[PDB]
Design a protein around this motif. Structure first.
Motif, short mmCIF file in Angstrom:
data_model
loop_
_atom_site.label_atom_id
_atom_site.label_comp_id
_atom_site.label_asym_id
_atom_site.label_seq_id
_atom_site.Cartn_x
_atom_site.Cartn_y
_atom_site.Cartn_z
N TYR A 253 46.54 13.20 56.38
CA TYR A 253 47.21 11.91 56.47
C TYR A 253 46.22 10.78 56.26
N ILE B 14 46.79 7.80 53.59
CA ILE B 14 46.74 6.38 53.96
C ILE B 14 45.63 5.66 53.20
N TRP C 121 46.58 5.23 49.50
CA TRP C 121 47.54 4.16 49.26
C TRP C 121 46.89 2.79 49.45
N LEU D 163 45.07 1.67 46.61
CA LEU D 163 45.90 1.35 45.45
C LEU D 163 46.34 -0.11 45.40
N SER D 164 46.19 -0.85 46.50
CA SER D 164 46.57 -2.26 46.50
C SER D 164 45.50 -3.11 45.81
N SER D 165 45.34 -2.92 44.50
CA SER D 165 44.40 -3.70 43.73
C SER D 165 44.91 -5.13 43.58
N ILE D 166 43.99 -6.08 43.44
CA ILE D 166 44.37 -7.49 43.39
C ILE D 166 43.34 -8.28 42.59
N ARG E 194 43.49 -13.87 43.17
CA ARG E 194 44.65 -14.73 43.39
C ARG E 194 44.30 -16.21 43.22
N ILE F 105 48.20 -15.01 38.52
CA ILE F 105 47.52 -13.73 38.65
C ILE F 105 47.14 -13.28 37.24
N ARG G 172 50.32 -10.96 35.29
CA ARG G 172 51.65 -11.43 35.63
C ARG G 172 51.61 -12.75 36.40
N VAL H 26 54.45 -15.04 39.03
CA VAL H 26 55.69 -14.86 39.78
C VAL H 26 56.30 -16.19 40.19
#
Ligand code: CLR
Ligand code: CLR
Lengths: 168, 115, 115, 168
Positions: free
Chosen positions: A52, A56, A59, A62-65, A68, A83, A86, A88
């Motif tokens: 687990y 965790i 994941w 995986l929150s690439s950024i 901003r 960004i 993209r 928004v």
């Protein structure tokens, strides 16, 4: 560091610290892999807790950024949410604020943070120093000198806070 | 928005995904529950039952219960009835599922080992 | 639209779902390929290797290939590069996995039965 | 049936025929279950073919539909795309048409169908009779007497087709 950041020439850029969480999760679970506790006498194996951990950490990584950013360019910029790739959120003023937020515990100790409020924007959490109020609105005046929009305070309007753009 | 782009990247919209994770926990846990009853009823091959992993999948159970609850709470303010019905149904099925496995483990207590 | 409602009901938007079905076909066929390779290499348990279901999963292979293709064709006109990349990647991986299983079955030919 | 359906008092309603295909798939599989061919001498089992048939039939059966309707009410109706529950498509005219479409084989035989064109609308396929051309615009004039919008023909404008609402 007190001087360099406030002018924030044209755009500002921002990132997240969840990559740190993913990195320490990966390091801790990699430590957990080799030569863990030998509790076969406990009639159980505890490899699925670090499994687990794999899930965790993978994941959270995986929150690439990418960086901003907004149109906080020191011009008539619309403060459109930007960004790499993209886009928004778009809005003609009236949404990008700076607000002081307060939190309390059971004892009653007060902790102060700051948030650049808007449609899915990024906060202005200061670096781990919130026991007193110090000067409050001097950094707000510096943000005003940047590209004056708001400097909101706690509770309702009342007093002790300044607004610049209004939609009526 | 571009759900498209929402599903695009960098991360994803609010919660959601964290709610559908409880769904796939329900998938795998219902699978091992089905294997457990199947081994209890006919084939009788207790050597290969889930006698060996007993507390870690219970911890996974409770973390899935907490996850589904927190996802329901974090997705209720969308104002849409379908999302609330979704999350509440997943919470209910996970809770009844958990109580079912608790009852079955408490029933088969003479087959494990002894202290 | 309300992807929400899109995912709501009565049916669903165009194709899509028909494309993500090839994904879960890829999942199950990859699992079967992994089991086949695992039983070929070490355990040597030809009794329970998939020698028995031979043509029906090949037919599943080919309908999945055609399905991924038809989904790519039926989803290309949206004008967005991400959907086309998604569909083409799924087509490429399905074709590669099909050719891999064809090579595997043509290799292990002396192990099934004789005519 | 010629004087019942073209009057179409106010709204019209529409459905799909995929439920027939789902029911037929269910019937075919239920035939296939009990006492199928015994081809163990073929060193194979063919239960996965009706299993895939069940997957397809269950998915096709899931295509439920409450009475696809519009605002074809014989008034100044908006022709808003209407479904019991959710609603999707809305537009001020210029989108709901009726168009004749043609299909050909290798030999060259022509088959004629009709479609109520619009944003995700339903067609007006006639009941299995397309070998001759017959009357063309007589049913088109009946649709015009209903709520005159368009009666489009094949290819470009040219001639032999009538329009009623235009957006310029
Ligand atoms: C890691 C998080 C996502 C939880 C997932 C739990 C997974 C990894 C656990 C829970 C159920 C487990 C299985 C339960 C039953 C069997 C059959 C038994 O004879 C040997 C162990 C085996 C094969 C287990 C392997 C690991 C397993 C699949
Ligand atoms: C029906 C459509 C969706 C295609 C899916 C095919 C599924 C149902 C088929 C294809 C692969 C198959 C498995 C392949 C291998 C094994 C191990 C073998 O020792 C016995 C059969 C068994 C356990 C099969 C069971 C059924 C199976 C999972």
């Amino acid at each position: 560091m007190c001087w360099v950041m406030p002018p924030s020439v044209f755009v500002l850029e921002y990132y997240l610290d969840t990559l740190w969480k993913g990195t320490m999760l990966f390091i801790i679970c990699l430590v957990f892999i080799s030569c863990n506790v030998l509790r076969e006498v406990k009639y159980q194996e505890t490899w699925c807790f670090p499994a687990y951990g794999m899930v965790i950490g993978l994941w959270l990584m995986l929150s690439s950024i990418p960086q901003r950013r907004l149109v906080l360019n020191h011009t008539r910029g619309m403060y459109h949410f930007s960004i790499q790739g993209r886009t928004v959120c778009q809005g003609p003023m009236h949404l990008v604020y700076v607000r002081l937020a307060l939190s309390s515990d059971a004892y009653g100790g007060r902790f102060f943070q700051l948030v650049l409020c808007g449609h899915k924007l990024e906060p202005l959490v200061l670096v781990q120093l919130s026991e007193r109020y110090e000067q409050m609105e001097f950094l707000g005046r510096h943000l005003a000198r940047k590209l004056n929009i708001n400097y909101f305070d706690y509770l309702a309007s009342s007093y002790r806070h300044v607004v610049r753009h209004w939609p009526l | 928005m571009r759900w498209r782009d929402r599903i695009a990247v960098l991360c994803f919209p609010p919660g959601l995904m964290l709610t559908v994770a409880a769904l796939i926990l329900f998938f795998i846990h219902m699978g091992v529950f089905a294997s457990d009853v199947h081994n209890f009823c006919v084939i009788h091959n207790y050597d290969h039952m889930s006698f060996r992993y007993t507390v870690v999948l219970i911890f996974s159970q409770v973390i899935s219960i907490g996850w589904a609850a927190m996802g329901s709470l974090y997705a209720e303010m969308t104002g849409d009835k379908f999302l609330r019905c979704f999350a509440l149904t997943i919470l209910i099925l996970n809770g009844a599922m958990f109580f079912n496995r608790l009852c079955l483990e408490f029933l088969a207590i003479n087959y494990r080992e002894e202290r």
